[PDB]
Amino acid sequence: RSRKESYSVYVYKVLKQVHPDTGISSKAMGIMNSFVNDIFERIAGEASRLAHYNKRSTITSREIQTAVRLLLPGELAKHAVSEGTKAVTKYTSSK
Amino acid sequence: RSRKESYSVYVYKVLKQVHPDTGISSKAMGIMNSFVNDIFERIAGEASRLAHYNKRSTITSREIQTAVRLLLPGELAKHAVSEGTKAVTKYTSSK
Amino acid sequence: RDEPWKRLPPPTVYPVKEARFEKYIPPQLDGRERALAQPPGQVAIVIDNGSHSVRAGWNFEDKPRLAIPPIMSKYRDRKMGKTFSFAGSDCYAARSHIRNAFEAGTGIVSNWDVMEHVLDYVFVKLGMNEDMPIVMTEAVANLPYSRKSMSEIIFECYGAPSLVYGIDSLFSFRHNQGQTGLVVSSSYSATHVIPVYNRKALLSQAIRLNWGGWHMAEYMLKLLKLKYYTGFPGKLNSSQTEHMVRDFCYVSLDYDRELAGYLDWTGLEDRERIVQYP
Amino acid sequence: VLRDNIQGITKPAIRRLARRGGVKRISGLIYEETRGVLKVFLENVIRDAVTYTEHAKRKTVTAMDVVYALKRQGRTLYGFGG
Amino acid sequence: XXXXXXXXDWSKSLLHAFRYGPRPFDPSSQAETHRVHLNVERIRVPEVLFQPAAIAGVDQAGLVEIAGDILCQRLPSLPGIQDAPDAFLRDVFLTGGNTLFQNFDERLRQGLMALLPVGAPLRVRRAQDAILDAWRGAAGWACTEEAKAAWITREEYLEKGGEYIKEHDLGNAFA
Amino acid sequence: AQAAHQALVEQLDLHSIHKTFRNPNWRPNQRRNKTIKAILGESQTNIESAPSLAPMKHYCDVTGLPAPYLDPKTRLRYHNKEIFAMIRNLPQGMGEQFLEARGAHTVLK
Amino acid sequence: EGEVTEMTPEEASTLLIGLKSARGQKKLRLDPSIYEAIQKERVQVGDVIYIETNT
Amino acid sequence: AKAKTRSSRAGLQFPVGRVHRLLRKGNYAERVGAGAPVYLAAVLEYLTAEILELAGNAARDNKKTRIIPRHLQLAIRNDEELNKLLGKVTIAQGGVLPNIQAVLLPK
Ligand SMILES: Nc1ncnc2c1ncn2[C@@H]1O[C@H](COP(=O)(O)OP(=O)(O)OP(=O)(O)O)[C@@H](O)[C@H]1O
């Protein structure tokens, strides 16, 4: 079995946040999972190359932010960056 | 002085091997250097993804060979695998 | 030109002789009744521990009673809820969890959990309901650990008065009434050459070639796998290639002349041997 | 090894694909060309897929092999993994 | 070519003769694709006993060369025996199961005739029941005085150990 | 229909017959079923195999005919130009299997 | 007729030659003047030769 | 103890040790095999040779004994495989292939 994991439960939670009375099929869920994984690999990769280009051996939130600025086009970036800076602030308000 | 490494002497040696009576310009030298760097990053990247796909933490000559089979097209790949196998065999023999 | 295949005769084809089972389960108990009637000191059970065919019987006869491969197989059925374990020729080669007592390619026993069940099948089908001496064969220059483990299985598992090891080719020498010669014996695992001087083997200088009938079968399988190159629709077992080798191979007298003119068109219809499949 | 199968991509199927693509009128020499293009495409994908399968020392081409092939070819496919 | 022929395939290539035979090609029928043809495998596979290093790449010597090495280079150089060619060549016989091939003893006889000096009374024969005489020899040996003087009883196994060897003239060397 | 096959499976069995002679006091050891390398490593006889030193007649390894010359790209002995054609257009992954059948494949590690 | 098996100088002179045929080899003791006719010919290890014994 | 290079043992020119270091400190895997640097160096050296050869040919064609970017461009854009390999690569100061369509040709 090996406990094959995914981003299922999280996608479901966010779905019920933005739309309480709206469901999702299995195929669409798999597509959302593949989307999450893809963006993850892309951002993390670009962040890795960012750290490597500047001879720095650490991927901080800065590299992630720059990677988002490079990858996500237009407003999608802006909002995302905000949603990041928010999160990392709250994490520093209870740690 | 902070010395910066390059593939200059190596591509020069290769140049002398294949064409003893020809020269090379500085611009074309940098182009060849960037070329070798790009292919290195490509093959090593694809080999890394190959190792990660099969839950392996070691890039052996097999991963490199498969990566070359995936990247280089047709006869180029054939001769590449040929030269690679020859080199790794000759290295295996001569300790 | 229609001539080279117009007057050509219809082919004479041979089917596949795969080593299948055979419908016999004898619980032969008529040997112990004759064995207990002889005077003591002249009754012993002889087991040829052959790599292709373990043979076993009593010494006062001429043919061996049991002649089986070292194949065993054990199962568990959850649709029935029962553990099976039968061995020998009773395996069909429909299920196969086959593992052999001999290591593949060398006549040195190193799969003792199989050899124990093979000897168990031997002592069951001979009839043991209770202590006879055992004469048993081995390979030339056998490893000491294998002899130690075999002796441990003979004494500790079953319980025997005595056993003694010998080389089977030298037994066939002593039965053939020779005194001094050069025994060349090509077995299933290796081909031995042993010089014998006045009924004594000179084992300090015997030489074994590392080729045998199993190597014949495996190399024949490799060449039929590489001859029919684009994919052959058929299960290419090793045993059916062995039965091809048994009845379709002969050592040529003058090899370099026979070989170079072998695939000529004139007369290939009588050199060629053809095999069907279902 | 069966026979042909390049003709398995029948005429009304290609017509359907053109309809979904938004094509009003189709030539007669379109179908063979489409069969050729699809052949080249499938060759390029299956080659890399089988390569990934061989590197994993498997005799069964998995879906993830196809996904990896498509991703490295530059056509990421969602709904199967990766 | 048609104008020249009017004015005037598989049968050329040997690979069709090698895979399929002199008959024409397989039309992908039921009882035609499922056929294996044997041409060279008849004489290539039982030839590895004599030329091992070339056909199958086993880096050892041939049977003829091993027999010649023992008869001509080791046995005359061994002290304690009288006649190296005049005794060992009286009876060279063939025992094992991988021997019942047509024309196997004659090949070994021609090889030893090429190796040995002229005039040696070479007489190569074979056993009577090649796959079953290995059992019958230990059957006839089993209840004699040398076998009685070579058994290992149970208390001898309990005392001497496991790797104990009664040195018989048929068994291996004692240790 | 399958009752005869079931009876043949049932009567051909070892656990169906009670072991009237097996000693139950004996217990098997785990450290068995080794290889020749392991047994030779325990004892550190069977080193009487001898190689050769003689000119070998090299034959073809695609077919069995005598072949006098090899290749630079794939190192295959071959008889004539038909076999050379079939060597230079064979699908990949088999040009190494011919050297596997002949020996000295030297696969990567 | 036959293939030379060995070229062994015995004394220190007489040189034995084994002449291998397809029927059997045979030792042969040579005079120290016929060996200087063998040696002018380029016979090394395994050349088949044709020695007249008388002439 | 008379040290020798790994490139010499592999019969190559490209640095095996350098490639090995880059693979180790390049965030590609936790561990890296011993055949990987020699194999990779061999492939890089081979590709280098294939380009430099055709580039030398193109240089010879223009009566010049020094390979310039133009010669590299002419070498890559003619070799279909090399072109596919460098399809998304722009060679600086390499120009384009002299190619004029048949329709634009004089009547
Ligand atoms: N009629 C036949 N013609 C040719 N070969 C045969 C024939 N019958 C049996 N064989 C061969 O004999 C071999 C079996 O030999 P056998 O079982 O006597 O060896 P073995 O005594 O088990 O070897 P070992 O002593 O190493 O265990 C098989 O490989 C089979 O190919």
Closest CA to A62 of A75, A81, A79: A81
- List the domain range (segments joined by +) for residue H51: 1-107
Give the end-to-end CA distance of chain D in Å, rounded to a whole number. Answer: 32
Task: Round to whole Å and give the CA distance between F75 and B69.
Answer: 21
Does C158 contact F at CB distance below 8 Å? yes
Is any Cβ of chain F less than 8 angstroms from the Cβ of H95?
A: no
What is the residue-wise DSSP string for C14-79?
A: B--------S------TTHHHHTTSPTTS--EEEE--SS-EEEEETTSSS-SEEE-S-EEEEEETT
Residues preceding chain discontinuities in chain B with C to N over 2.5 Å: none
Query: How far is CA C197 from each of CA C203, D41, E86, E128, rounded to the nearest angstrom?
Result: 11, 75, 12, 21
Cβ neighbours of residue D80 under 8 Å, at least 6 residues apart?
A: A30, A34, D63, D64, D66, D67
The CA distance from B32 to B56, in Å, is 33
Q: Which parts of C are annotated binding residues for ATP?
A: 51-53, 55, 187-189, 242, 246
Residues forming a β-bridge with H35: none
Mutate to test the interface with F, among E59, E70, E115 (most CBs of F within 10 A): E59
Nearest chain E Cα to G19, which residue? E117
Kindly give the interhelix angle for A61-71 and A26-53, rounded to the nearest 10 degrees: 110
Residues C251, E46 contacting (CB under 8 angstroms): yes
Tell me which chain F residue has its CA closest to the CA of residue E172.
F45
Extract the runs of DSSP E, i.e. beta strands, from chain B. Answer: 23-24, 58-59
Residue partners of C238: CB distance under 8 A and separation at least 6:
C217, C218, C221
Residue type, B19: H
* Interchain touch B–G (≥3 Cβ pairs closer than 8 Å): no
Cα separations in angstroms, F3 against C202, E53, F9, G29 = 58, 54, 10, 84
Q: How far is the CA of E139 from the centre of ligand 1 (A)?
A: 19
Q: What distance in Å separates the CA atoms of residue E49 and residue E107, rounded to the nearest whole number?
A: 11
Measuring CA to CA, how many Å separate C38 from each of A54, B5, C32, C58, C127?
Answer: 96, 93, 10, 12, 17
Distance CA F22, CA E73 (A): 52
What is the number of residues in chain F? 109
User: Is E61's CB within 8 Å of F50's CB?
Assistant: yes
- Residue of C26, C158, C185, C180 whose CA lies nearest to C90: C26
Residue in the structure block whose two tokens are 């020779």? C178
C-beta of residue H55 within 8 angstroms of C-beta of residue H71? yes
| Beta-carbon separation of F45 and C143 below 8 A | yes
H/E touch flag: 3 or more CB pairs below 8 Å: no
According to the entry, how was the structure determined?
Answer: cryo-EM
Q: Please choose, from the candidates C50, C70, C86, C76, the residue with its C-alpha nearest in 3D space to the C-alpha of residue C187.
A: C50
User: DSSP class of residue F82?
Assistant: H
Q: How far apart are CA B59 and CA F71, in angstroms?
A: 31
Q: What share of chain C is helix, strand, coil (3-state, %, to 5)?
A: 30, 20, 50
Crossing angle for the helix pair B75-93 and H35-61, nearest 10 degrees? 130
Two tokens at A43? Answer: 């951002």
Dihedral sign for Cα atoms in the order C36, C38, C41, C46? negative
Whether residues F106 and B82 touch (CB distance < 8 A) is answered with no
H22: tokens are: 């880059």
Q: Which residues pair with C86 in a beta bridge?
A: C73
- Cα-to-centroid distance, E159 and ligand 1 (Å): 38
Q: Are strands C273-275 and E36-38 parallel, antiparallel or unpaired?
A: antiparallel
Phi-psi map region of A19: left, alpha, beta (phi>0 left; psi -120 to 50 alpha): beta
Number of structural domains (chain A) is: 1
Tell me the residue type at B51.
A
Token pair recorded at residue B41: 């990053």
**Sign of the Cα pseudo-torsion (E19, E21, E24, E27, in order):** negative
Residue E120 backbone dihedrals phi, psi, to 5 degrees: -75, 130
Kindly tell me the burial class for residue F29, based on how many C-beta atoms sit within 10 Å of its own C-beta (0-12, 13-18, 19 or more): exposed
Which of B52, B53, B65, B81 to mutate: most D Cβ within 10 Å? B53
CA-wise closest residue to E172 among C47, C144, C149, C141: C141
CB-closest option in F14, F57, F66 to C86: F14
Spatial separation of the C-alpha atoms in residues E150 and C43, rounded to whole Å = 16
Residue with tokens 């150990």: E161
Contact flag D81-A34 (C-beta cutoff 8 Å) = yes
A77 in Cβ contact with A69 (< 8 Å): yes
* CATH number of the domain bearing residue B28: 1.10.20.10
For residues E37 and C154, is the Cβ–Cβ distance under 8 A?
Answer: no
CB contact under 8 A, E118 and G24: yes
Ligand 1 centroid to Cα of residue H40, in Å, is: 50
The span from the CA of D71 to the CA of A58, in Å, is 27
Query: What is the DSSP code (8-state) at residue F109?
Result: -
Residue type, D77: L
SS3 content of chain B, % helix, strand, coil (to 5): 75, 5, 25
Contact D73, D66 (CB under 8 A): no
Stretch (H or E) spanning E124: strand E124-126
- H helices of H1-106, in order, are 6-9, 16-24, 35-61, 69-78, 80-85
Contacts of E114 in chain G (CB under 8 A): 20-24
Output the residue whose Cα is nearest ligand 1's atom 16: E97
The answer to whether E112 and C193 are in contact (CB under 8 A) is no
CA-CA-CA-CA torsion sign (B14, B20, B22, B24): positive
Q: Whose CA is nearest to atom 5 of ligand 1?
A: C246
Which residues of chain B make contact with D52, given a CB cutoff of 8 A? 50, 53, 66, 70
Main-chain dihedrals φ then ψ at residue C76, nearest 5 degrees: -135, 130
Strand stretches in C108-249, DSSP E: 134-138, 162-167, 181-186, 191-196, 207-209
The alpha carbon dihedral of A14, A20, A26, A28 has a sign of negative
Nearest-CA distance from E7 to chain F in Å? 31
Q: Is E57 annotated as a binding residue?
A: no
In one-letter notation, the amino acid at residue F52 is S
How far is the first Cα of chain G from the last one, in angstroms, to the nearest whole number?
15
Q: Do residues D52 and D65 touch, judged by C-beta distance below 8 A?
A: yes
Cα–chain center distance at F88: 27
CA C68 to ligand 1 centroid distance, Å? 13
Residue type for F51, please? P
User: What are all long-range contacts of C24-27, with beta carbons under 8 Å and residues at least 24 apart?
Assistant: C25/C90, C25/F11, C25/F12, C26/C125, C27/C125, C27/C127
What is the C-alpha separation between A7 and H49, in angstroms, rounded?
A: 48
Range of the domain at A53: 1-95
* Full DSSP string of H55-80: HHHHHHHTT-SEE-HHHHHHHHHHSH
Are the C-beta atoms of C196 and C202 separated by less than 8 Å?
yes
Mutate to test the pocket of ligand 1, among C54, C146, C187, C210 (most ligand atoms within 8 A of CB): C187
Domains contained in chain H, number:
1
Which protein residues touch ligand 1 with a CB less than 6 Å away?
A: C 50-53, 107, 168, 187-189, 213, 242, 245-246; E 96-98, 100-101, 131, 134
Q: Sort out which chain E residues have CB atoms less than 8 A from C64's CB and list them.
A: 132, 135
Chains within contact range of chain A (3+ C-beta pairs < 8 Å):
D, H
Chain A positions in Cβ-Cβ contact with residue H27 (cut-off 8 Å): 48, 52
The tokens for B74 are 């047709």
Q: Which domains does chain D have, with CATH numbers?
A: 1-80 (1.10.20.10)
Q: Minimal Cα distance from H44: which residue of B?
A: B36
Token pair listed for F52: 């050769």
How is A28-77 classified by DSSP, letter by letter? HHHHHHHHHHHHHHHHHHHHHHHHHHTT-----HHHHHHHHHHHS-THHH
Is the sign of the CA dihedral D40, D45, D51, D53 positive or negative?
negative
The label of the residue with tokens 């398995």 reads: D8
Two tokens, residue A8: 């299922």
* CA-based end-to-end distance of chain C: 34
Closest CA to H70 of H87, H98, H91: H91
Buried b (16+ CB within 10 A) or exposed e, E122-147: bebebbeebbbbbbbbbbbbbbeeeb
